[PDB]
Amino acid sequence: RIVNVKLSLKRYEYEKPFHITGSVSSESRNVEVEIVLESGVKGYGEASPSFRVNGERVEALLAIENAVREMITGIDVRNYARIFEITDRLFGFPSLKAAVQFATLDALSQELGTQVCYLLGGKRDEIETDKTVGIDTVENRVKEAKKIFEEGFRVIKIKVGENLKEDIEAVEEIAKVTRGAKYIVDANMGYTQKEAVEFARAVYQKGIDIAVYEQPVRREDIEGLKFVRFHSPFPVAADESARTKFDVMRLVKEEAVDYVNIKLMKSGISDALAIVEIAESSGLKLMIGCMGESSLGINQSVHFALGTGAFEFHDLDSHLMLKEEVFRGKFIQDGPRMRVK
Amino acid sequence: RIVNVKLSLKRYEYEKPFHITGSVSSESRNVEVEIVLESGVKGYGEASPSFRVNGERVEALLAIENAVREMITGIDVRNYARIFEITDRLFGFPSLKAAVQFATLDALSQELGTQVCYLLGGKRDEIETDKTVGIDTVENRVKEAKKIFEEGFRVIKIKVGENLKEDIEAVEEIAKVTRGAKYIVDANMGYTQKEAVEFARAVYQKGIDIAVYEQPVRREDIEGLKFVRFHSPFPVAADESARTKFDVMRLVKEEAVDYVNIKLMKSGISDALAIVEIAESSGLKLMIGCMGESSLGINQSVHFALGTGAFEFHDLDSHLMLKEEVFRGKFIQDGPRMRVK
Ligand SMILES: [Mg+2]
Ligand SMILES: [Mg+2]
The missing domain is CATH 3.30.390.10 (Enolase-like, N-terminal domain)
Structure with missing residues (x-):
């Protein structure tokens, strides 16, 4: 009690x-x-x-x-x-x-x-997280990308959305100095439908492959998400448009996206479990993300990811970008790798 | 291990x-x-x-x-x-x-x-099952219905499907001598779409109310299930048509039914959990049923029902119809009531 x-x-x-x-x-x-x-x-x-x-x-x-x-x-x-x-x-x-x-x-x-991950199924013993390159000048973006790559991260998340031309330039440059890594591009709703498609096509033409293209358009534009999905060569994901299990059920019915970025901060444990089941009962694929959690907070997602083993990609780098005196998670962090004690 | x-x-x-x-x-x-x-x-x-x-x-x-x-x-x-x-x-x-x-x-x-029900959420401490009246002469059906009502059951499941006219008569006769009980009618795929609709309309005309109208048509006839749902006053359920989590996603996408009768024997625990999540993320409602389980087998459904607390109706009576030496369930039963120890 x-x-x-x-x-x-x-x-x-x-x-x-x-x-x-x-x-x-x-x-x-x-x-x-x-x-x-x-x-x-x-x-x-x-x-x-x-x-x-x-x-x-x-x-x-x-x-x-x-x-x-x-x-x-x-x-x-x-x-x-x-x-x-x-x-x-x-x-x-x-x-x-x-x-x-x-x-x-x-x-x-x-x-x-026991542990939370086992309570949720204990499907996996390890998961790897990408690390994010925030918006900055192309020069600084390339610099940070190299540093992340040198740290061992083989999945690099690139933020874009405020300047199409520069965003394309940034992704191309980053790709040159990180051969061997997979890339996730997140526009955080910054592009219009046509801009979103132009971005993907431009990058695709350079021979660059994007593992996941996150929320390119505004949150209410479900039709827009679908438009990009059907006219862009890369897997499109809903982030801001996918908060509840009802939103996901709607996105699936509309065949709006290839991916949904589940976040406990948006759905809580209850809806997150529902979304996992919904994805596994349809063509939808998932990735798990985060907001601004510290190590104690990321711990919640690590146990969720490890337990359900429902994600193709994990973007749980929030605690890595924050100055934290002492680690407080019930998990082990080893570079991009995360395991349970 | x-x-x-x-x-x-x-x-x-x-x-x-x-x-x-x-x-x-x-x-x-x-x-x-x-x-x-x-x-x-x-x-x-x-x-x-x-x-x-x-x-x-x-x-x-x-x-x-x-x-x-x-x-x-x-x-x-x-x-x-x-x-x-x-x-x-x-x-x-x-x-x-x-x-x-x-x-x-x-x-x-x-x-x-702990116990399985708690592992699954421990949502409820008690559930109530109905009891079934198999197909027989109207006279014998009525006799079994009275007996079931006398035993304390307030939800009576009635089998129909082989004789439309006699089926209507059987339901009308049972209703008169079990005032206060709710009824579930199960055709087990025996009717054509139009016969299914006519059966429902006739019962309705006599002022009788049916809680759940189970699988009125053939299993592959999804549009038939939908037709019955949109043209008859009672909630329509899929049983034989709903075996896997994928069947359920399809039923939901096509708005084919009001209910899905989940059975561990058709789905297993894994798909059943997915179906519960799919239902809670949509307009679908659920009932949990059984095949020919003995007390040990019914126990599986009792714990699933108690833990998830996801069902409107429970049809867990197979063990009450079988002659069994010793009770073998990890649950307590008092008439239609079932609780855990
Ligand atoms: Mg995002
Ligand atoms: Mg049935």
Whole structure:
């Protein structure tokens, strides 16, 4: 039984300003969640709210701690489905929903003498994450790309979306100095339908292959996502357009995308599990991503990825871009590789 | 880790012959599955093969005991997702796939010190099953209906499909002497689309309400199921047409039915979990059914239902129709009520 739920503000600084389409961050403000059971067991989760994607604000999350306590204290974690249904009402605070739900499983796994990944199926023992190259000058982008490659990452995520011509130039240059690596391009909704297609064609013509082309158009433009998918040689993914299990069910029905970038910060554990099942029951493929989680937060996704083994690609580099005094995940990080203890 | 698997035939005789559209059974021949772990823990499951629904034959299941053994031994039950994936290759032996997957969770939960239902979410502490009135003369159907009503069952499942006129009469007669009960009518594919619609409209005209109208047409007639759904007042369910998670995705995409009768014997635990997620992500509603399971076999569905709490109706009565020496389920039953220990 849950006897207490604590929310705490935790600030983390980025090695350097992180720039993506329409956004620049030098700080990541998260809300840490701790659940305490009467037995003494403590489960931990982390919420990394996004105003841009989920409409959330950290101050708002912190303001509802008491309501969260009233919602689930007294409930036994072995009846976790009840906790999941209740926390699903927090659809306006998706990142907190995710933290609370994971902390619940974290606590439950401890009581059962096991780990969250095994509770979810323990399908994989290891997964590899890519690392992101934020928007900057072509020169700096190429520089960072080389450094990432030299660090051992064989999947490089390239941000674009604000300048088609320069974006194409950047991808081409990066490709030259990182032969052997796969590439993921993320426009974070910056392109129009035709621009998105032009980008893919231009890069394809140079002999460059893109593993995943993330959310090229605006979030409401489902038809646009489909248009790019059907007129672009690379796998197209929905990120901002895919927050709930209902959004995914809709994207599948419309045959809108080849991929969906699942993020616990958008869907929580409950919807994430539904999306995994939906993808495995259709032609949809998945990749798991992140927002601004610290190591404790990425831990939630690592266990989810390892347990379900449902992803072709993993973009869980958030903690790698933040200055963090001490590692706090229940997993092992070895370069791009991640395993469980 | 699993060090061995054993399959063995188990026969159960019916209190009386069970008659449904195009099939009469006097006995249920099941295949019990036992998995042994290096720790000494033993997991149990039961396969109730259906030749009519799954194309399975008891002899064939027993014949591949060695193959199954080779497939799963050496795998830790904490990595159950791996076992699920491997056993998914037994799509030609669905009932066996179910028995093995459940035996796995049964063994896993024992090691973790909990029960299968809690492992699956522990959503509910109690569920209620209906009881079936097989095909017979109107007079005998009415007699069995009264008896079932007297036993405390408030949801009565009525078999029909071989005689439209007599079927209507049977349902109308049963309704008069069981006021207060809800009814589920199952045609087992016996009607043409128009006959199915006429059956429903006639019952409706007499002021009778049908909770679930199961598989009124042939299994391949998806548009027929949809036709009945759009032209009759009661919720229409797919049973024989819904075996795999892929069948369900198709049924949802085509808006063919209101309900899907999930059966572990058709889907196994893996697909059943996917179907539950697909339903919760759409307008689809679910009921859980059975084939010819004995108490040990029904236990698999009871835990699935209690843990997921995903069903509106429960048709888990096969063990109540079979003569069984000793009860062998890990659950408690009081009339239509079923709870866990
Ligand atoms: Mg993205
Ligand atoms: Mg049926």
